RNA sequence: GUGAAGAGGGAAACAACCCAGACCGCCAGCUAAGGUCCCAAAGUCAUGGUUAAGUGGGAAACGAUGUGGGAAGGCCCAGAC
RNA sequence: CGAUGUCGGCUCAUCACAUCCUGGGGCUGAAGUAGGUCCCAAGGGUAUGGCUGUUCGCCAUUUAAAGUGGUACGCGAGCUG
RNA sequence: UGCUGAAAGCAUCUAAGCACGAAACUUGCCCCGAGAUGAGUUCUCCCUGACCCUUUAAGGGUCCUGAAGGAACGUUGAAGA
């Protein structure tokens, strides 16, 4: 999990979802791609 | 579970055939005679109030004399109270002896600790003494500093300072019961319990198992 | 929206009971119940149920689609039910059922015995397979998740409990 | 002719009973504080406690809007160096439900001896019953 | 311009900001800035919207299918995403 | 500036988290043991000596760890000089 | 970290609903504690006389009476300036 101020999609499988008022990027394919805005 | 009220006879040791010397404290636990049973209906909680020992008939005042008289029990040297566990009943005139602790393994003994009078910071809170030489001036056992310079312009509550040490209730937890001598109203506990010889002790089953 | 528009067909032998928002669905595989969200307007058109947005709420279609899916899953449960298959991977890993408690041995120094809920039944075809069955989709999914959670499948060899259909992305250990 | 001033001996005080079920905490507290102060009576005087006694029942069922039920924190300091305690709204309702109404009303009342005197007439209960049936409180729809 | 050399009301408190210049008395009235749920005087005022963050009640580059309004544009029952 | 005593040490602390250890977790160029980095978390704990007035620093040997800081770079109407 | 699940035919830990999760929080362990003026609860003991006055009321005064209990004094304590 990358805690960044700027969260973006990194590949075609990265999906942006807002959980508990926080923007998060979750990737089904690559575990290295998951980030959370913080 | 309820406990009993005894008296510290002193300390001694018990030799086991394996060659181990267990240091024990001899507690003489005479019969505790119940004097009042408290319930949810009248007092809002469940407990029993017991007494033990005897008191001088010209020394017992009339209010407590009448209180004992209602229960129909001879006056003891004090009154102690034990909270009742669930599903534990007792009648008013009932006498409870030291055989209650026949198969318990550890107890919690609470008594009023020895009084050390006005104790210094070094003795009371294990503070370090300052230098006995190297030029020191009238400050060998003083507590040193107690605050900071003008931003928190007061001493903080709960600071460790000199004062009355001891003569307060202290509980020693999880002592091994070495022997229950029901025949002569004795209880031998492993270790040292608080309080001087002849003081009252409250022995209750170990809360921490 | 698009999910909520398509109605669900209620088969024979399955009786519904609409009581305001709280709804019960009885069938041959048991009887499930659920308290719906007030913002959903559901009605039975004598052979099927239809879902519409109750007025006065912004998220009408979203709740309606959620309600549609929930009742559809309930209908699947009360007629066919759900069967979730899990498989164990690794040497010495095994499971067994004793009425309603699964005894897992997943290379731990103690046994791991998980108590099953009321409506869930298990069955092991082999030593390394568990077949869960139940009407409620949420409950069977939750028990499946908890069982996999004890020893989640690691990526280097895939050892641990895993679902029958899921794939594990194996990773090579570079020395 | 100088203005009339109430007198503490001859001032009459009535007893009221309010059901706090499902009512907004602050919107109920304002009316409660106003009546305890006595501002709802023409004979009001700033330095005399001319208010009425109020019994508030069903305090543990009071309502709040938004996410205040889990986010409103009630801070209090014990006076010791590390004694900073805090408790959320739901924790206060579960542990000491009456305290929520008490703190709210006490905050909305004046400060000083007269303020504490006004506050002393509010008797709030967690349940649906009180012991003051003898005083005959009238039901007040706030 | 104000303070110095200027009091009163507001900005919690706050010489210099805003409103406004105290000759004295009154248990009279109208307003300015600023306010009108309670401390604390005055709208739980009326009509139509926006916010779900206690944002209001402290801040930037940058990031995001949060959500309201408006005008176009590209693909599309020869079937769009 | 009609006096607010100042570097280091001793004694005694208290707070913050940008956490040194223990606790929970994501990714790993994470096979295991042992690590790297980030997020949550201040409840408790966080060396003894050689050298110099030293803070700092180097060194010897431990420890799970030998934290970074605030408090008049805390503390002389408590001590040293 | 999840289950079910739309908004957004898919996907999605969340928007409705449900589960797990740390020495942090509240308890659980020990001690003080109704001056908690919101001064609480329970058990027990003691007192069951005659009259005057004026400003007539939680009023003042005289005689008889002195209880339960407390205090003072003395011998003192592993309690204590």
Domain limits, chain B: 1-209
Q: Which of D105, D101, D89 is nearest to D126 (CA)?
A: D101
Token representation of residue D6: 């109430």
Chain D nearest-CA residue for B156 = D81
Token representation of residue B43: 């007092």
Min Cα separation D141/chain B (Å)? 34
Token representation of residue B11: 């300390």
**Cα separations in angstroms, D66 against C38, D25, D63, D69, D71:** 18, 13, 10, 8, 10
Strand D122-124 vs strand D53-57: parallel, antiparallel, or unpaired?
parallel
Phi, psi of D71 (to 5 degrees): -110, -20
User: CA C29, CA C11: separation in Å to the nearest integer?
Assistant: 13
D81 touches strand F (CB under 7 A): yes
Show contacts of C106-115: CB within 8 Å, 24+ apart: C106/C150, C106/C151, C106/C160, C106/C161, C107/C151, C112/C150, C114/C143, C114/C146, C114/C147, C114/C150
User: CA C131, CA C136: separation in Å to the nearest integer?
Assistant: 15
Token representation of residue D33: 């504080």
User: CA A29, CA A26: separation in Å to the nearest integer?
Assistant: 9
| Coil, strand or helix at A6 | coil
Token representation of residue D1: 């002719």
Min Cα separation B151/chain D (Å)? 15
**Cα separations in angstroms, C71 against B27, C35, D33, D38:** 71, 11, 50, 56
User: CA D41, CA C74: separation in Å to the nearest integer?
Assistant: 61
User: CA C6, CA C16: separation in Å to the nearest integer?
Assistant: 19
**CA atom of C151 to C1′ atom of F23, Å:** 21
C166, C141 contact by CB (below 8 A): no
B8, B186 contact by CB (below 8 A): no
User: CA B52, CA B55: separation in Å to the nearest integer?
Assistant: 9
| Coil, strand or helix at A34 | coil
Query: Any idea of the CA torsion for D83, D84, D87, D88, to the nearest 10 degrees?
Result: -170
Strand G, CB < 7 A, residues 144-163 of B: none
Q: Which of B23, B70, B29 is nearest to B52 (CA)?
A: B29
- DSSP secondary structure letters along chain B: ---EEEEEEEEEEEE-TTS-EEEEEEEE-PPEEEEEEE-HHHHSS-EEEEE-S---TTTS-HHHHHHHHHHT----S--EEEEPPTT----SS-EE-GGGGTT--EEEEEEEPPP-EEE-HHHHH-PPP--SSTT--S-SSS----S-SSTT-SPPTT----EEES-SEEEEEEEEEEEEEGGGTEEEEES--SS-TT-EEEEEE-TT-
**What nucleotide is nearest B129 when CA is compared to C1'?**
F11
* Positions on chain F within 7 A of a protein C-beta: 10-16, 25-31, 38-40, 43-44, 71-72, 74-76, 78-81
Q: What is the DSSP letter of D59?
A: G
Phi, psi of D20 (to 5 degrees): -90, 20
Token representation of residue D108: 């909305």
D2 touches strand E (CB under 7 A): yes
D37 touches strand E (CB under 7 A): yes
**CA atom of B140 to C1′ atom of F10, Å:** 11
**Cα separations in angstroms, C125 against C98, C144, C160:** 14, 16, 18
The answer to whether C and B touch (≥3 CB pairs < 8 Å) is no
A33 annotated binding-site participant? yes
Strand F, CB < 7 A, residues 127-146 of B: 127-131, 134-139, 142-146
User: CA D63, CA D22: separation in Å to the nearest integer?
Assistant: 5
Q: Which of C125, C118, C48, C117 is nearest to C85 (CA)?
A: C125
Residue with tokens 């001694």: B12
C104, C112 contact by CB (below 8 A): yes
User: CA D74, CA B141: separation in Å to the nearest integer?
Assistant: 44
Q: Which residues of B144-174 are buried (b: 16+ CB within 10 A; e: fewer)?
A: eeeeeeeeeeeeeeeeeebeebeeeeeebee
A27 annotated binding-site participant? yes
User: CA C147, CA C120: separation in Å to the nearest integer?
Assistant: 13
| Coil, strand or helix at A32 | helix
Q: Angle, to 10 degrees, between the axis of helix D98-108 and the axis of helix D25-37?
A: 60
A7 touches strand E (CB under 7 A): yes
B1, B85 contact by CB (below 8 A): yes
User: CA C23, CA B26: separation in Å to the nearest integer?
Assistant: 70
* Positions on chain G within 7 A of a protein C-beta: 1-19, 25-26, 28-32, 38, 41-46, 68-70, 78-81
Token representation of residue D84: 């900073």
| Cβ contact B156–D81 (<8 Å) | yes
**CA atom of B28 to C1′ atom of G67, Å:** 40
User: CA C151, CA C125: separation in Å to the nearest integer?
Assistant: 20
Sheet holding C94-97, edge to edge: C94-97, C101-105, C112-115
**CA atom of D18 to C1′ atom of E45, Å:** 27
For chain A, the chains sharing at least 3 beta-carbon pairs closer than 8 angstroms are none
D71 touches strand E (CB under 7 A): yes
Question: Which residues are paired to C25 by β-bridges?
Answer: C16, C32
**What nucleotide is nearest B136 when CA is compared to C1'?**
F79
Q: How crowded is residue C21: how many other Cβ atoms within 10 Å of its Cβ?
A: 16
User: Quick one: which H or E segment has residue A26?
Assistant: strand A22-27
- DSSP secondary structure letters along D7-55: -TTT----EEEEE-TT-BHHHHHHHHHHHHHTTTSTT--TTS----EEE
A11 annotated binding-site participant? yes
Strand B21-28 vs strand B32-38: parallel, antiparallel, or unpaired?
unpaired
Token representation of residue B34: 């119940």
Q: Does B157 touch chain D (CB under 8 A)?
A: yes
User: CA C43, CA C131: separation in Å to the nearest integer?
Assistant: 36
User: CA C81, CA C136: separation in Å to the nearest integer?
Assistant: 8
Residue with tokens 């039944």: C121
Q: Which of C55, C56, C57, C60 is nearest to C4 (CA)?
A: C60
User: CA B81, CA C103: separation in Å to the nearest integer?
Assistant: 48
User: CA B203, CA C3: separation in Å to the nearest integer?
Assistant: 70
Min Cα separation B40/chain D (Å)? 19
Q: Is the dihedral of CA B126, B128, B133, B139 positive or negative?
A: negative
Q: Does B154 touch chain D (CB under 8 A)?
A: no
Q: How many residues does chain C have?
A: 175
Query: In degrees, to the nearest 5, what angle opens at C-alpha C28 toward C-alphas C145 and C43?
Result: 85
Q: Which residues have a Cβ under 8 Å from the Cβ of C137 and sit 6 or more positions away?
A: C73, C76, C77, C82
Q: Count, in order, helices (H) and strands (E) of chain D.
A: 5, 6
C132, C83 contact by CB (below 8 A): yes
User: CA D53, CA D16: separation in Å to the nearest integer?
Assistant: 6
User: CA B70, CA B48: separation in Å to the nearest integer?
Assistant: 15
B123 touches strand G (CB under 7 A): no
| Coil, strand or helix at C94 | strand
Q: What is the DSSP letter of C154?
A: P
User: CA B93, CA B182: separation in Å to the nearest integer?
Assistant: 20
Q: Which of C86, C161, C81 is nearest to C124 (CA)?
A: C86
Q: For chain B, how big is the Rg over CA atoms in Å?
A: 23
For chain D, the chains sharing at least 3 beta-carbon pairs closer than 8 angstroms are B
Min Cα separation D84/chain B (Å)? 13
B83, B1 contact by CB (below 8 A): no
D26 touches strand E (CB under 7 A): yes
Min Cα separation D79/chain B (Å)? 7
The answer to whether D and B touch (≥3 CB pairs < 8 Å) is yes
D124, D16 contact by CB (below 8 A): no
B161 touches strand F (CB under 7 A): no
User: CA C134, CA C121: separation in Å to the nearest integer?
Assistant: 7
C47, C9 contact by CB (below 8 A): yes
């Amino acid at each position: 999990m990358k805690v960044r101020a700027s969260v973006k999609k990194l590949c075609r499988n990265c999906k942006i979802v807002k959980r508990d008022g926080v923007i998060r990027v979750i990737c089904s394919a690559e575990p290295k791609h998951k980030q959370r805005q913080g | 579970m309820i406990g009993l009220v005894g008296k510290k006879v002193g300390m001694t040791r018990i030799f086991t055939e394996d060659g181990v010397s267990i240091p024990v404290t001899v507690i003489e636990v005479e019969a505790n005679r119940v004097t009042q049973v408290k319930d949810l209906a009248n007092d809002g909680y469940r407990a029993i109030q017991v007494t033990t020992g005897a008191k001088k008939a010209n020394r017992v005042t009339k209010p407590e004399a009448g209180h004992f008289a209602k229960a129909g029990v001879e006056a003891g040297r004090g009154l102690w109270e034990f909270r009742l566990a669930e599903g534990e009943e007792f009648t008013v005139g009932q006498s409870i002896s030291v055989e209650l602790f026949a198969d318990v393994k550890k107890v919690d003994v609470t008594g009023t600790s020895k009084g050390k009078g006005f104790a210094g910071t070094v003795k009371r809170w294990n503070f370090r003494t300052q230098d006995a030489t190297h030029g020191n001036s009238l400050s060998h056992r003083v507590p040193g500093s107690i605050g900071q310079n003008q931003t928190p312009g007061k001493v903080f509550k709960g600071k460790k300072m000199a004062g009355q040490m001891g003569n307060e209730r202290v509980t020693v937890q999880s002592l091994d019961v070495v022997r229950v001598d029901a025949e002569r109203n004795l209880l031998l506990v492993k270790g040292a319990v608080p309080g001087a010889t002849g003081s009252d002790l409250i022995v209750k089953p170990a809360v921490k198992a | 929206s698009r999910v909520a528009k398509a109605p669900v067909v209620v088969p024979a032998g399955v009786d519904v009971k609409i009581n305001g928002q709280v709804i019960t669905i009885k069938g041959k595989n048991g009887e499930l119940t659920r308290t719906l969200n007030d913002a959903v307007e559901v009605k039975h058109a004598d052979n099927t149920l239809t879902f519409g947005p109750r007025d006065g709420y912004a998220d009408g279609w979203a709740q309606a689609g959620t309600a549609r899916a929930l009742l559809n899953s309930m209908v699947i449960g009360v007629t066919e039910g759900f069967t979730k298959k899990l498989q164990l991977v690794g040497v010495g890993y095994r499971a067994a059922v004793k009425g309603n408690v699964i005894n897992l041995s997943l290379g731990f120094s103690h046994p791991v015995d998980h108590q099953l809920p009321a409506g869930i039944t298990a069955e092991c075809p082999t030593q390394t397979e568990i077949v869960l069955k139940g009407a409620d989709k949420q409950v069977i999914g939750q028990v499946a998740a908890d069982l996999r959670a004890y020893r989640r499948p690691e990526p280097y060899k895939g050892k641990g409990v895993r679902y029958a259909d899921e794939v594990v992305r194996t990773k090579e250990a570079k020395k | 002719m100088k203005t009339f001033t109430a007198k503490p001996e001859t001032v009459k005080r009535d007893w009221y009973v309010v059901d706090a079920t499902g009512k907004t905490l602050g919107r109920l507290a304002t009316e409660l504080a106003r009546r305890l102060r006595g501002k709802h009576k023409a004979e009001y005087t700033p330095h005399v406690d001319t208010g009425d006694y109020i019994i508030v029942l069903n305090a543990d069922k009071v309502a709040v809007t938004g996410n205040k039920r889990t986010d409103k924190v009630y801070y209090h300091h014990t006076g010791h160096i590390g004694g900073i305690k805090q408790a959320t709204f739901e924790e206060m309702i579960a542990r000491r439900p009456e305290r929520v109404i008490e703190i709210a009303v006490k905050g909305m009342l004046p400060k000083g001896p007269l303020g504490r005197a006004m506050f002393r007439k509010l008797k709030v209960y967690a349940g649906n019953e009180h012991n003051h049936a003898a005083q005959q409180p009238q039901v007040l729809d706030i």
